[PDB]
Amino acid sequence: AENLWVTVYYGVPVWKEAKTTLFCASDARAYEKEVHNVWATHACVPTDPSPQELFLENVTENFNMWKNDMVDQMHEDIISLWDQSLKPCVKLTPLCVTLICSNMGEMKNCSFNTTTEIRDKEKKEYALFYKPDIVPSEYRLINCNTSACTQACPKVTFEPIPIHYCAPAGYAILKCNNETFNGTGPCSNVSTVQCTHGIRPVVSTQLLLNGSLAEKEIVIRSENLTNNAKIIIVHLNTSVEIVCTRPGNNTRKSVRIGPGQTFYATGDIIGDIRQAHCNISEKQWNETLQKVGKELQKHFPNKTIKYERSAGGDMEIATHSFNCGGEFFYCNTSKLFNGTYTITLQCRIKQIINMWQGVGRCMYAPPIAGNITCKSNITGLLLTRDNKTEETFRPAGGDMRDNWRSELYKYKVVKIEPLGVAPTRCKR
Amino acid sequence: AENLWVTVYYGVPVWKEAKTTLFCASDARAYEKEVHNVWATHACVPTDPSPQELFLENVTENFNMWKNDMVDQMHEDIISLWDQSLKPCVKLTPLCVTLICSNEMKNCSFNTTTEIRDKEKKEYALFYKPDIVPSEYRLINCNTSACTQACPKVTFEPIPIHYCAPAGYAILKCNNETFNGTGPCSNVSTVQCTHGIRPVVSTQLLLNGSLAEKEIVIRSENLTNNAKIIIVHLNTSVEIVCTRPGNNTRKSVRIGPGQTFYATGDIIGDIRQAHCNISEKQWNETLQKVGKELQKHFPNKTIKYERSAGGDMEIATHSFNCGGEFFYCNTSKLFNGTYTITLQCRIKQIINMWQGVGRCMYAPPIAGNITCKSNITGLLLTRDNKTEETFRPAGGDMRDNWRSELYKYKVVKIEPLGVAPTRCKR
Amino acid sequence: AENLWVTVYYGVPVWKEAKTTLFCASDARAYEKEVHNVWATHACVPTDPSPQELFLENVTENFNMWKNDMVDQMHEDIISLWDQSLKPCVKLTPLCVTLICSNEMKNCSFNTTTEIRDKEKKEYALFYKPDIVPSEYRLINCNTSACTQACPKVTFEPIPIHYCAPAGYAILKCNNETFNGTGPCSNVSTVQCTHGIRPVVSTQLLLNGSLAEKEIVIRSENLTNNAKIIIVHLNTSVEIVCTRPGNNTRKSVRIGPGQTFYATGDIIGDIRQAHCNISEKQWNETLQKVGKELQKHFPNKTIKYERSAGGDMEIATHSFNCGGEFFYCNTSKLFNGTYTITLQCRIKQIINMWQGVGRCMYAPPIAGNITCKSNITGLLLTRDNKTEETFRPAGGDMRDNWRSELYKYKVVKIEPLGVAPTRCKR
Amino acid sequence: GFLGAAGSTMGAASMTLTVQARNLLSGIVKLTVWGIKQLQARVLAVERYLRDQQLLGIWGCSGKLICCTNVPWNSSWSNRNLSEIWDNMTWLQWDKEISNYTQIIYGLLEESQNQQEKNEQDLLALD
Amino acid sequence: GFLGAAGSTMGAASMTLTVQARNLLSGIVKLTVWGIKQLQARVLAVERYLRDQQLLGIWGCSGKLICCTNVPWNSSWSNRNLSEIWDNMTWLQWDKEISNYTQIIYGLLEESQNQQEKNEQDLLALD
Amino acid sequence: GFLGAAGSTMGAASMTLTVQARNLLSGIVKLTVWGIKQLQARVLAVERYLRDQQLLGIWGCSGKLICCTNVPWNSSWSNRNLSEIWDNMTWLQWDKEISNYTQIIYGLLEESQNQQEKNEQDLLA
Ligand SMILES: *[C@@H]1O[C@H](CO)[C@@H](O)[C@H](O)[C@H]1NC(C)=O
Ligand SMILES: *[C@@H]1O[C@H](CO)[C@@H](O)[C@H](O)[C@H]1NC(C)=O
Ligand SMILES: *[C@@H]1O[C@H](CO)[C@@H](O)[C@H](O)[C@H]1NC(C)=O
Ligand SMILES: *[C@@H]1O[C@H](CO)[C@@H](O)[C@H](O)[C@H]1NC(C)=O
Ligand SMILES: *[C@@H]1O[C@H](CO)[C@@H](O)[C@H](O)[C@H]1NC(C)=O
Ligand SMILES: *[C@@H]1O[C@H](CO)[C@@H](O)[C@H](O)[C@H]1NC(C)=O
Fold it and tell me: Minimal CA–CA distance to C209: which of C409, C354, C402, C408?
C-alpha cells in the first residue's frame, strides 16, 4: 500500500502459555456432595460443568507434561485439603501407653489401662493391633517415637470422586486429540475445553487404578529413555479386572477417652481366620504383559525384554497398595512380573498410615466391620529400566505426582491478552 | 406508530426475587461496641445507619414470611458468632472428676490441680442439682462433650442490630398494619436497612419484641393444621419482673497454667427461691382480648387455655437469659381461663445452646442478688368445641422468636436494563 | 473573561491527607525469604522494590510524626505477626512441675514424661536465676500464663522491610536534612516504597538505625514539658560489641509425642560473665557533642547525665536480641559526665514480649559462644540549673524505637478529578 | 430518590435515571468470617455492574443512558399498541410482559451494531 | 512521572494528565491475615476508580479527559480573576479554594446532561 | 464460539470479535482456604480487564472495537508486505512477530491522542 496507519483491534484471539490457579468442580448428584468425600462441596464448586467443544483449525503449539503446572497445583491441593480434613478430630495422644500384648501371628492381642469419662478413674480395655503397627512383653504404638496420630473420624470417606478442573476467568484450557500423542512435541489436532473430564484422584504405587485408557494401542511415555533413572508410564489399550478381599469377618468396638471422644479398634475375629488376598485374571494379564513387551521392544532396538521382581526396600515402596473402603492394603507383586518379551497375591494391611508422600501427618484408619471386597480396573503400569541387563524391567513408584501426570498429559493452560495492532488504510 | 425501532434504557426501576447475604449493623454509642457483646464491632459495621424513607406509589408486592430466608441467614449468623465467641476460652475438661457431694444446691468437693501439675489441693463449691448426675457425682457433660466457660468480657446483652443490604440490592417493607403475613401488601416502602431488632432467645413467650400499632394480630401459615405455631402480637405490652433474692458469692479456683474457673460460693444471709412477678390485672385483660380475637378465625367456638405440653424442662418451661444467668420458670398458673401472680423458677449453670446443636456452655455465677425487668409482647401458642377450645403454650426453634419481627421485609434484586419500542433511529 | 463555562479535568495532581493500610515488602536474596524470619515471604511481598525519584518543585506540606499513622499500623502488624509465629509450636505447659534446685545458674532437676505417658524419668538442666521463683522451685510463668517455645526455623534477625502504598495512594518524603519533625518541609519528593527499615527492639538506646547526614538532630513534642522522651540522631555511629564467653551446651529432652524442648546443659571449660564493650574515645566525643547541641534549646544552662531511673530491670537496663539470646546490660558506667569501657550483662530465657502485652516466650539456648557487633546510632533521654542539667536515659515503649525512622514520611490520597472555568461549549 | 418512580408510568419513570445508576456501586462500604462474607458480596456487586456496562458497550451505547438503535419491533413481540405503553403501564408490567423474548433481541442487536461498526470502518479501511 | 507537576501552574499541569490517571489501578500486585488485608485494599482501589469513571460517565465525558460543559460560572464561586488562575495558581491551591462549593457544581451537571440529551432524543425519536 | 477463529487469517478472524470480549468477565462464578484462593483469582480477572479498558480510553477508542488512529506505519516495523498479512497470516503469527516493538507504538498513541485532544480543547478554550 502507499501509506498506512496503525489500527487497534480489541478481542483478538492470541494467547501466551502462562501460570495460574485453577478451581476444582465436583460431579456429585445427591447429599454425598455435603457428606465429606474429602473433596466435597466444602472445597469445590457443587456440580454440573459445561460440555467440551470448539475444535480449532490449523493450530499448532508445543505441549509438555514433565514441566506442567496442573500436577503441582493438584498435589498442593491434595495435601492441604487432606490435612484440613484431618484436623477437626482426635488426636489419639492418650494411647501412647505401655501396651501388654501376647500372641494369627499378624494380630497381637494387646491390653492397656485407659481413662473412663472421669479422669480420676481408670479401667482396662483390650483390642487387637496389627503387628507392623507395634514395636517391642512391653509394647508401644509406633507413632509415639515420631508424632501424634489423628483418627480419620467417621463421616469422611476416602472414595475417589471424579473432580473437574475449570480454568478461571480470562484463561482457557487447550487439549491434544492426537491419539498416539507421546507427551511432547507439537500436537496439531487441538481443541479448547472449558474444563477437564472427570479425574479420579486415586493413589496407588507400582500400578495405576481406575485411570483413563487410550483409544489406540498401548502408549509408552518418559522424558529421556536413554536415561535409566526416569520412570516409564504405560497406558493399556484395555483394562484387566482385579479383585481384592479380606474374608475375615472382623468386628469393631469403641472405647471412650476423657470427654465424649471415642476411638474405634478391631475386636475379635468372628468365625475362622483367613489371609487377605487379591485376584487377577491370568489370561488377560499374560496377554497384556506380552503386548507391553512387544511395544517396548520397539523403542529399545531389537533387544530381549523381561520383567523381574520389585526393587524392594520399604514395604510401601516394595508392594502395591490400595485404599479400599477405609482400609489400606500392601500386596506383594512378585508373582505378577515373571516372564519375557487365575493368580492370587497374598496381602497385608496396616492401620497406622503415614501419608505416602511421607510429608503428611500420621493417620489411623479405623477398622471397618464385615468382610470387605474391592473391585477395580487396572489400566497403567509404572516401570523403571534396569541384552542381559537392559531386558529386565522393575516395577517402581513412591511419588504421588506420577500417578496423576499420566492423566493430565493432554492439557495446557493459556492466558488470553486480546489487544492487537495492525496496519491498514485509516484516519480518525 | 408506523414502524418503530428498539431503544435501550439503562438505570430503570425493575426488580426480581433475590438470594443474597445481608450485613448486620450494630447501634452502639461507646466502647461497648469493642467489648465483645457477641454482636460487637468485631462482627460487623459499628453504628450510624441512615433513616428509612421513599414511600412508593401504586406498587404491589406479594410478601411471605414462612417461605422467607432472612431468618435462615440470621440463624446461621447466630450459631457462627456463638461458636466464635466460645472458642478462645476454657475448655473445662479438668473438672470431669469424681465429686463427693452432700446436702436444690448440693455442696460438692473435689480434688484439683494447683499451678504445679504435680501437686493437688481440695476445693469446694455449690452446684445446682440439675447439673449433677450420680454419694459420688459427676457433671452431666462428661457423658456427652466438653464444656466451655463463657469467660468474662462476653456479655449476652441483646443490643439491637440493623440488617443492611449489600451494593446492588434493596429491601422492601409492608406498612399495612393488619398485614397477616401473606398476600399482596400495597402500602410498600423502601428501607435502606431495618429497624432495631433485639435478638433475644426465649420460649413460650416473646420478650422485648416489637408490638403492632393496630389491635392484636394473629399470624400462622395454615390455621386448619393443628401443628403450626401461632405467633401473637399484643396491642400493649405486659410488664414482668424476675429476681434471685439469694445474695450469692463467687470464688475463683485456678487450674493448671494461668487459667481460672468461677463457681458459686456460700449463700450469705438467708436462702430464698428465685421467682417472677406478672401484673395480674393487665395479664387477665390481655388474655381476654387474645381470646376475643382468636374466636374470629375459628367459627364461634369457645376457647380455653391449659397447662403446657410438658416434657423437657427447657421446652416445658419459660426460660430467660437476662443478668448473665439462665432461668427456667413454670407457667402453669399463668395460663388458666376461657375466652399479682408469682411464678416459681429454677436456674441452671450447664447450658446446652438452646438450638440443641451448639456445644455445652457454663454460665459463670454472678455475685449479688440480680433483678431483671422485661416486656411481654407476643405469645407462642399451638392449637390442641371441647378440644378445639383448648390452647397450649408452645416452644421450639430459635427461628420462631425472630420470624415474629422479620415478616414485613423482603429482599429484591434490581437488574436495571430495559428495552422499549419507539420512533428512535440512529 | 466575558462569560465562561464549567470544565472538567481528570487526572489532576491534587491530594488529601489519608488513612490506609500499608503493605510490607521484604528485601531478601535467597531461601531466607521462605525460611521464617518472622517477616518472611509468608507475610510480605517477596523482594525488588522500585527506586525512589520524582522530586517536586515549589511544593509545601505540613508534616508531623507524633500523631503519624504508620507507627501504629506497624506496631499492630508486628504484634499480630509475632503472635501468629509463636502459636503453632509448643505449648510448654508440662514443665510447670516442682523443681529441686541446688548450687547465677541453679542446677534444677525434675520428673518428666518419656514418650510413654504412663512412664517417667528424671532430667536435669541449668536455669537462670531470674527465671526461677521459690529448695523447691517453679518457673515464673505458671503463676501468669502458659509459655510457648520459640521453636527452631525461626530467626529474630532484623532484616530490612520496605513499606509501600497500595493502589491509588502515594508516599511523600522530606529531604530537609535538619528537619526537626514538624512544620512545613519544602524539599518534598515522592516515593513508591520506603527505604530499608530495620525493625529492631532495644531500650535506652537505638541500634542499627539510620543516621542523619548533617550534624546531630534533637526531637521532641514540647521541650517545655518534662515528661516527653527526646530522640537523638547521631552524626556518626559508635561501635559496640557484646559477647557471652561461656561455651554453653544444649540438650534436648522429649515430652509425650514427638515434641522436644531444649535447655542449657553443663558449661564446658570455665565460667565467665557476659559483657559488652564500647569504645570510650568515640563515646566520650559523641556524648560531648550531644551535650554541646542540647545547650541551644535550653538557654545557656549546664547539662549533665546521670544513672537511669531504675525499677524493672528491663526498663532499668539495655537489652538486645543477639544470636537468638536476650541480654540485659547495665548502662551506669556509660552516662557519667557534663556538658575502653566494659558493661556487665545478665541474660534471661523467659521473655515477656517487651510491650508487656504479647504472650510469654522461652528463648531456646544457643550452643557455642556468641558475638554480637552493632552500630549504635541514637539515644533515648528524658529531661529531669542544678536539676535541669541532669538527663536520665529511659524507655519502655517499642513505638519510640520506630518513630525515629518513619519521621520523614507521610501518606496521601489522590483526588484526580477537578473542575475549572474556561471558554467552552458542548 | 432511589426507586422514587418505581410505580409511575413508563413516560414518567424515564426521567432522571441517574439514581438507578449511581446506587449500583456506592455505599458506606485476626481472620474472621466477616472478611470473606463481605468481600464476596462486594466483588459480586462489581462484577454485575461491569457485565451491565460491557453489555452496553457492545451495543455502542456506553456513556449514554437512553440510546436509539436500529432493530425492528416485530408486532408479534407486543400485540398491545405501541403508543399506549408509554403512558399507561408501569415498568414492572413491561418487564413481566417482554422478559420472554430478551435473548432474541440481544443476539440480533449485536449484529445490528456490527452493521454500524464494520461498514463505518470499511469506509476507509476499504473505501 | 507520577505527580511530576503537582507544584506547577494550572496551565502547565494541564499537559500530560495520563500518568496521574493511569496509575490509579496498575501496580506490582493457608489462611492468613495478609490475604484479607490485601484484598480489601485491592477492592477499595477498584471501587474508587469505578466511582470516578461512573461520575464522569453521568456527565457525558467518559472517554474524554478534558471535557467542556454547559453550566455557568457564577462570579460568587470565585472573586479572583478568571484569566489569572490559569498561569498563577497551582492545582492544590485551586482544590483548597473551590472544595467548599463542589456539590453545587456536581448537582447542576448531573441534571444538565439530561437536558443536553433531551434534544438529541427528541430529534432522533420524536422527529 | 470462544477462540472459534484462532487459526483463521487476519481478515477472517476480524469478524465477530465480541466472543473474545464477552468472556473475559462472565462465568459460573467457616473460613476456608478455598474462599480466599477464589477471591484472589476473581479480583485478578477484573483488574486485568479494567487495565485493558483504561488503555483503550487513553487512545480514544473506548466503546469502539475496531478503531483507526493517526500513527504511521514505518516500514522498518514490518518488511513483509502490508497487503499480504490480511489474507495469509494467522493472528498468533502476527503477535509473535511484532510483539518486539509493542512499547514504541503504544507510547506514540499515548501522546497522539492527547495531541488532538488539545487542538479540540483549544478550538474553543
Ligand atoms: C484378648 O485378650 C483378652 C484379655 O484381656 C481376652 O478377654 C480376649 O478374649 C482375647 N481375644 C482374643 C481374640 O484372643
Ligand atoms: C462377605 O463375604 C461374602 C462371601 O465371601 C460375600 O458374598 C459378601 O459380599 C461379603 N461382604 C461384603 C460387604 O462384600
Ligand atoms: C461446704 O462444704 C465445705 C467442706 O468441704 C465447708 O467448708 C463449707 O462450709 C460448706 N458450705 C456450705 C454452704 O454448706
Ligand atoms: C438486691 O436486693 C435489693 C432488695 O431486694 C434490691 O433493691 C437490689 O436492687 C438488689 N441488687 C441488684 C443488683 O439489683
Ligand atoms: C547438675 O546436677 C546433676 C544431678 O542431677 C549432675 O549430674 C550434673 O553434673 C550437675 N551439673 C552441674 C553443671 O552442676
Ligand atoms: C567463640 O569464642 C572465640 C574466642 O573468644 C571467638 O573467636 C569465636 O568467634 C566465638 N564463637 C563465635 C561463634 O563467635
Answer: C402
How far is it, in rounded angstroms, from Cα C391 to Cα A65?
A: 71
* Residue E59 burial (C-beta neighbours within 10 Å; 0-12, 13-18, 19+): buried
Query: CA-based Rg of chain D, rounded to a whole angstrom?
Result: 19
How far apart are the C-alpha atoms of C272 and C265, rounded to whole Å?
16
Q: Which ligand is nearest to the CA of A272?
A: 1
- Which of A1, A12, A84 lies at the smallest CB-CB distance from F82? A1
Interface test with B, best of E47, E124, E127 (most B CBs within 10 A): E124
Most F-contacting residue of A4, A5, A9, A171 (CB-CB within 10 A), to test interface:
A9
CB neighbourhood size of A321 (10 A): 22
Residues B352, B291 contacting (CB under 8 angstroms): no
Tell the burial category of C355 from Cβ atoms under 10 Å away from its Cβ (0-12, 13-18, 19+). middle
Helix (H/G/I), strand (E/B), else coil: A394? strand
- Whole-Å CA distances, B201 to B76, B399, B401, E88: 14, 9, 7, 68
Q: What is the DSSP secondary structure assignment for residue A159, as one 8-state letter?
A: -
The answer to whether the CB atoms of F32 and A170 lie below 8 A apart is: no
Pocket around ligand 1: residues whose beta carbon is below 6 Å from it?
A 109, 111, 126, 268
Query: What are the φ and ψ backbone dihedral angles of E115, each rounded to 5 degrees?
Result: -65, -35
Chain D residues lying within 8 Å of A8, measured CB to CB: none
Tell if the CB–CB gap between F68 and D121 is shorter than 8 Å: yes
Beta-strand ranges (E) seen in D16-122 are 66-72
Give the helix, strand, coil percentages of chain B, each rounded to 5.
Answer: 15, 35, 50
Q: Nearest residue on chain B to D2, judged by CA atoms?
A: B54
- Residue A73: what residue type? Q
Q: Does the beta-carbon distance from F22 to D60 stay under 8 Å? A: no
Q: Which CB contacts under 8 angstroms, 24+ apart, belong to D110-119? A: D110/D58, D110/D59, D110/F18, D112/D69, D112/D70, D112/D71, D113/D58, D113/D59, D113/D60, D113/D69, D114/F16, D115/D70, D116/B426, D116/D60, D116/D70, D117/D60, D117/F64, D117/F65, D117/F66, D118/F15, D118/F66
- CB contacts of D39 in chain F (<8 Å) are 39
User: Can you point out the beta strands (E) in chain F?
Assistant: 66-72
3-state secondary structure A295-345: HHHHHCCCCCCEECCCCCCCHHHHCEECCECCEEEEECCCCCCCEECCEEE
Which technique was used to obtain these atomic coordinates?
Answer: cryo-EM
**A96, A143, A145: residue with CB nearest C117:** A96
CB neighbourhood size of A222 (10 A): 19
Q: Containing H/E element for B247?
A: none
Q: B54 burial class (0-12, 13-18, 19+ CB within 10 angstroms)?
A: middle
Alpha carbon of B142 to ligand 3 centroid (Å):
24
Which of C325, C371, C372, C373 has the most ligand 6 atoms within 8 A of CB, as the residue to mutate? C371
Q: Cβ–Cβ contacts within 10 Å for residue C252, how many?
A: 10
User: Which residues make Cβ contacts (< 8 Å) with residue C133, sequence separation at least 6?
Assistant: C139, C140, C143
Is C232 within 8 Å of C219 (Cβ atoms)? yes
C-alpha distances out from residue A252 to A369, B148, B406, Å: 6, 31, 49
Torsion of CA B197, B198, B202, B206, to 10 degrees: -70
The owner of cell 482385579 is A242
What is the rounded CA–CA span in Å between residue D3 and residue C305?
A: 73
Contact B43, B24 (CB under 8 A): yes
Distance from Cα B277 to the centre of ligand 4, integer Å: 15
- Contact (CB, 8 A) for C293 and C216: yes
- Chain C: nearest CA to B259, how far in angstroms? 7
What's the rounded Cα separation, in Å, for the pair A155 and A37?
8
Contact partners, residue F70, CB within 8 Å, separation at least 6: A5, A427, A428, F112, F116
Measured CA to CA, the distance from residue B379 to residue B220 in angstroms comes to 12
